[PDB]
Amino acid sequence: EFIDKVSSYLTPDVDIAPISQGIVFTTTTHPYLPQKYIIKYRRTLNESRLLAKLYLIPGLCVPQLIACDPYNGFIWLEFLGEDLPGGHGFSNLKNFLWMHDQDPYSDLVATTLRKVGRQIGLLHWNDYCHGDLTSSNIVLVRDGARWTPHLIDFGLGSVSNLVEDKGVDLYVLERAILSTHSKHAEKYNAWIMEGFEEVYREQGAKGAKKLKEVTKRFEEVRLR
Amino acid sequence: MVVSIIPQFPDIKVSLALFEQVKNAKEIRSKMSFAFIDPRLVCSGEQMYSAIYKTLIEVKYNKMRTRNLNSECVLCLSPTSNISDAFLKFGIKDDSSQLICLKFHVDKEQLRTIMTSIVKGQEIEFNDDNLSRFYDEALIRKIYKLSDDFKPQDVNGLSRALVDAIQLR
Numbered sequence A: 001e002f003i004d005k006v007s008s009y010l011t012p013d014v015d016i017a018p019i020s021q022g023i024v025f026t027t028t029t030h031p032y033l034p035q036k037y038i039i040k041y042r043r044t045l046n047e048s049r050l051l052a053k054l055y056l057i058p059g060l061c062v063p064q065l066i067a068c069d070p071y072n073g074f075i076w077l078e079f080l081g082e083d084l085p086g087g088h089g090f091s092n093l094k095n096f097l098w099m100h101d102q103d104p105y106s107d108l109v110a111t112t113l114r115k116v117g118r119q120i121g122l123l124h125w126n127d128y129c130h131g132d133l134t135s136s137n138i139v140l141v142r143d144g145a146r147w148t149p150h151l152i153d154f155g156l157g158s159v160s161n162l163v164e165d166k167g168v169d170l171y172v173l174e175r176a177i178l179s180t181h182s183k184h185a186e187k188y189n190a191w192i193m194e195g196f197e198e199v200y201r202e203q204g205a206k207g208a209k210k211l212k213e214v215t216k217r218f219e220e221v222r223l224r
Numbered sequence B: 001m002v003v004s005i006i007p008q009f010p011d012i013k014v015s016l017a018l019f020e021q022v023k024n025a026k027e028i029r030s031k032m033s034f035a036f037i038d039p040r041l042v043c044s045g046e047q048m049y050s051a052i053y054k055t056l057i058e059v060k061y062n063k064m065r066t067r068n069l070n071s072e073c074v075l076c077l078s079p080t081s082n083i084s085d086a087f088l089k090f091g092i093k094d095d096s097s098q099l100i101c102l103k104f105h106v107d108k109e110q111l112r113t114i115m116t117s118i119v120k121g122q123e124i125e126f127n128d129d130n131l132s133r134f135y136d137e138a139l140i141r142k143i144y145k146l147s148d149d150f151k152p153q154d155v156n157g158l159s160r161a162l163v164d165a166i167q168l169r
Helices: A002-010 A044-055 A093-099 A107-125 A163-180 A185-200 A204-223 B025-030 B045-061 B069-077 B083-090 B108-118 B137-143 B155-167
Strands: A017-020 A024-027 A037-041 A065-069 A074-078 A138-143 A146-151 B002-006 B009-020 B035-037 B099-103 B122-124
Touching (some): A044 A065, A065 B045, A093 A107, A093 A138, A093 A163, A107 A146, A185 A204, B035 B069, B045 B155, B069 B083, B137 B155
Antiparallel strands (some): A017 A024, A024 A037, B009 B099, B009 B122, B035 B099
8 A cells, every 4th residue: 555655654653644646644743743644755956946946036936845865756845825714615716716706706716816916926037837727826824914825836846937938827827727617716826816916016117028038928828 | 951852763863962152162173073163154943954964865875975974964955065164164163152063873862962071151051042143144145045035024035045056965
């Protein structure tokens, strides 16, 4: 059993709790220090590196890299996200969106959504790429009564200044939101876009131009 | 003084102690089984302990470079593959007023007095409050090559950045 090998690896000392496959766990045990954590087993080396670089970008929210065994393919990441009240599920964007779907005309959803775009704007301004920007790969952390967006599984992620790559990532996202087929899907994407633009429209005349380029490419990609 | 184990490695206990007012650094350094780590470059337990982990993982699953695990942790604590440099920047200096005393190996009593035999200085609790009096941020930023644009809200912010560096060995 693969679980057998994993278990033998971290010993009985570490409680695990399988969570996903094709392989991820939870554990309340910290790998070296005397609440809940994440273990990825498996490519990973990529994800680790990235997470390190991404952390260092001011403003950009991503999981803490806690430990990394590159020789066996283990990474312990911090645990982000909680459970929406009323059984609406784990607090990634999809679930948040389904939850508020019949009542989307609030600050909470729009400002939570602009924030999401702020993260992507950030990511792209620094010539980085997710390359799997699904609505399931954006988990929300509670900050008082606001929500704070973070990005996750940078397994298929890379560093790129190719404007096409930025358009694809946006497209993957806007596509995933359209996947649900909500009436309000169009707005979400507009709002995520606002927050994206907001970010570039900040970095000045440079920003506006580079922004204009990614904007046109994205439109093109949406067109293809 | 703390004895601790790493979850994945219960067979290995490790002892850390922190010292103030050390008057015989050079005496020690010159006449050197412990590792004497310069606490100007350690700021948290999260840092120290992650580097221990990495040490073990390295000896268990990859390769051991240095003579023992004490050395190897000094090596693993650093963000470099060059040994002599890690020893030099993370080991005690001749101007070392504080140090972290470390070793790998059950006798708490004999240790506490093997150490104080070596270190003409004043022992104090190995904990974060104490560690964050003696780390030198600018020095850390030098050694761990950190952008001045990187501006963490607190020590956790700093720590994280070093764990990252220690872990991507």
